[PDB]
Structures are given as C-alpha cells and as structure tokens.
Amino acid sequence: KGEELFTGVVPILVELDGDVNGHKFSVRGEGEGDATNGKLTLKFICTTGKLPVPWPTLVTTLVQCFSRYPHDFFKSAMPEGYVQERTISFKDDGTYKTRAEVKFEGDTLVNRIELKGIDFKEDGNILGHKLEYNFNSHNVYITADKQKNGIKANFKIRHNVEDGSVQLADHFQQNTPIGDGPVLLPDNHYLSTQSVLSKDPNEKRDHMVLLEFVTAAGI
Ligand SMILES: [Cl-]
Ligand SMILES: [Cl-]
Ligand SMILES: [Cl-]
Ligand code: NA
C-alpha cells in the first residue's frame, strides 16, 4: 500500500533544528524524489545565517524511501511514516545525535529532524570548515531490526579534507515505524547512493543544491 504512494514524482520538504557545541542553527529544504529512477533533487538553505558545520556533514541526515524499485520497509511504512535515529561519530572529533520523523503530510513527504552535536573541536575539520564541497558515494547494508519492526544500518562515511586527508564519520542507524499498521520487513540488502553537490548562483543564503541517485541491490 505504501509503495503505491511512490509511483510518480513526490514533493519533499525537509526541516532541521540543530545545536552543535551550543551553536544553534536551522535548515529548510525542498525538492522532489522519484523512486522509479531513484533520483532525488533538493535545495537546502540555512535559515539562521551562516551554517556552523560543513554541508557535507549533514547530507546523510537531510529519505531512503526513494531508493529505486528493484518489499521495502521505508515505503511500506507510509503514509504514517517512520522514525530515523542516528549517532554519527567523527574520528578524533565530536559526535552528532539525530532523530527524525519521515511521513506524508498530504501529498508532501516531510523529513523533520532534530540534531545535537557535542564535544567538537572548535578548530577541527567540522567547526573549522575544513571539508571539501563534495560527498563520497557509499554502499550501505540495510538489515532487518526484528526487535523494533524496522531496520538498522552501520556504515562509514569519509569526508574529503582540504589538505588531502579524509575525515571519517562512523554512522549508526535505526529506523522504526510510527504507525501501528503493518509494515514490510526487507531482505538484507545494499543501497548504493551517489551524490552531486552544487550551488544556486542566485541564492545569497548559505545553501546546498543536492542531486542523488539511490539504487538497490540484493544478495
Ligand atoms: Cl531564511
Ligand atoms: Cl561558522
Ligand atoms: Cl560546506
Ligand atoms: Na557560525
């Protein structure tokens, strides 16, 4: 039933409230997703001024229901949706804790996020804005989390640093349905995401334009 909500192009709205080392900020994003081709197109702005962290560190936080149709937990949870929570551990640096609700509100798929970052170095790669404006593709293994009627995933993200090094970000993820309704649990499978970051030449606010392709593969 939920998968039928994704037969065409679906409008997306994203809202994030963040606090990293006491630096508070908010983000709004808008665009669309197409599960037929696994394509996401979104623009995000910081609505509070300068973004105090690099845009690439927010990519994974800022809708896996759009993975290209190859049983899908993320789609079957809709329209009631799912909670997505992560801890992201930046090597030699701080950690993010995120909680989000992803659900339909009318025709729009809405991702509403709270993010708290702690224990960051003010001069490190994150708060010091030392990361390149790109995002390395990753193949993520999605597994059933039977004890919570949802899924889990653990994976590394490597952010390119402006000195040629990499900043590792260990991701720990758990998703659980919001509704009491039935949901499909997937076979363990991989999602390949490949991302292109760009700028809107007419946007004066701190912002990110994002194009992503998400494809699924079995075992
Ligand atoms: Cl604004
Ligand atoms: Cl800043
Ligand atoms: Cl950035
Ligand atoms: Na700032």
Author numbering: 3 to 64, 68 to 75, 81 to 229
Give the authors' words.
Efficient and selective incorporation of TMSiPhe was verified by both mass spectrometry and crystallography. Moreover, the electron density of TMSiPhe was clearly observed in the crystal structure of a TMSiPhe-containing green fluorescence protein (GFP), an easily crystallized protein. Crystallization of GFP-Y182TMSiPhe takes ~1 week at 16 °C, thus confirming the stability of TMSiPhe after incorporation into a particular protein.
